[PDB]
Structures are given as structure tokens and as C-alpha cells.
Design a protein around this ligand. Structure first.
Ligand SMILES: O=C(O)C[C@@H]1CN(c2ncnc3[nH]ccc23)CCO1
Length: 167
């Protein structure tokens, strides 16, 4: 039993809710919140901008030190950093950004990072300003992630479309 509330069950291990991931993280304080990161960990907008703003820019400060030491992530890759006031840990995962021409096949590699964590609160990778089709993102999630994932979808209209079209 866990503290996630109000989710629709899509499969054995995938759950979905119309929610603001920032507000959901603040309420649940999950072990892991996933950030929709880029390779530079520049958290300017979308989910990343919202999560970083909620940490009062502490996420960005920590991320800048990470990059200065380690260099950029790979598209499809991830790193574990602090969750600050939102979660124990933040798993920064880089899905491909269609608006940069990155290969959508890398979306499966991106979701594979979730399998290193037993339970996660996450957004749909490569959705929103990353330019991929969220219906496709949900399908890849369900077909790739085997650990327990709680998906937060900000947009109510999109949430309803994702549920209604789910096979
Ligand atoms: O979850 C969605 O509905 C789609 C994502 C969410 N993206 C966000 N952008 C800025 N702030 C945010 N807070 C929470 C989500 C979020 C934008 C669109 O793609």
C-alpha cells in the first residue's frame, strides 16, 4: 500500500491522474519524482521549469554543479539528484526532444531508467514542449516500465484523451 490517491489503474503497474506534478510531489513526498530533463540540466520550462521553480532554484544550483563535474547527460539517459522539498530523490530523465530532431526510438531507452526504481511519480516523457505524441509516450511507458509508475498529466483535456484512447 502507498499514499498515491485518485489514480486510474491502466495496467498491473501503471497508474494515471490529472494532476500538477509539482502539487502531487508536495503532497506525497514520493521516494522518486521524475524530471523531464534535457542533457544540460537547464530547467527552463515545461515540467522541469515548474519543478525547479518549486525548489526555489535549488534544483538548478545542484544541477549546475553536476554538469560542471560530469558533463552533459545522453539523450535517453538519466541521473539521480536530490528531490529537495519535493521528494527524496529526483530522477532526471532525458527523453528525445522532437523539436530538436532527436530519434523517437530513444524514448524507450529513456523509460528504461524508471526500472531502476521500485516506485516513481513521473510525467509522460517527451510530451509537452518536447514535441512527441503523448499517446505514443504512454504506450511506450506501459510497454517498457515494469516498476510501479504514477503518471501525472497536467492538462485535463489530454488526460481524458489518454484514458479514452488507451488500449
Ligand atoms: O502533463 C501535461 O499535461 C503535459 C506536459 C506538462 N508540461 C508542464 N509544463 C509546465 N509546467 C508544468 N507543470 C506540470 C506539468 C507542466 C507542459 C506540457 O507537457
Amino acid at each position: 500500500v502507498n499514499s498515491f490517491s485518485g489514480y486510474l489503474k491502466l495496467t498491473d503497474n501503471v497508474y494515471i491522474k490529472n494532476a500538477d506534478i509539482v502539487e502531487e510531489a508536495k503532497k506525497v513526498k514520493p521516494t522518486v519524482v521524475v524530471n523531464a530533463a534535457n542533457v544540460y540540466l537547464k530547467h527552463g520550462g515545461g515540467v522541469a521549469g515548474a519543478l525547479n521553480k518549486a525548489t526555489n532554484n535549488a534544483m538548478q544550483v545542484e544541477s549546475d554543479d553536476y554538469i560542471a563535474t560530469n558533463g552533459p547527460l545522453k539523450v535517453g539517459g538519466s541521473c539521480v539528484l536530490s528531490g529537495h522539498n519535493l521528494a527524496k530523490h529526483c530522477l532526471h530523465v532525458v527523453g528525445p526532444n522532437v523539436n530538436k530532431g532527436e530519434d523517437i526510438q530513444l524514448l524507450k531507452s529513456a523509460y528504461e531508467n524508471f526500472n531502476q526504481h521500485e516506485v516513481l511519480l513521473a510525467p509522460l516523457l517527451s510530451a509537452g514542449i518536447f514535441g512527441a505524441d503523448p499517446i505514443h509516450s504512454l504506450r511506450v511507458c506501459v510497454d517498457t516500465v515494469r516498476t510501479n509508475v504514477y503518471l501525472a498529466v497536467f492538462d485535463k483535456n489530454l488526460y481524458d484523451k489518454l484514458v479514452s484512447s488507451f488500449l
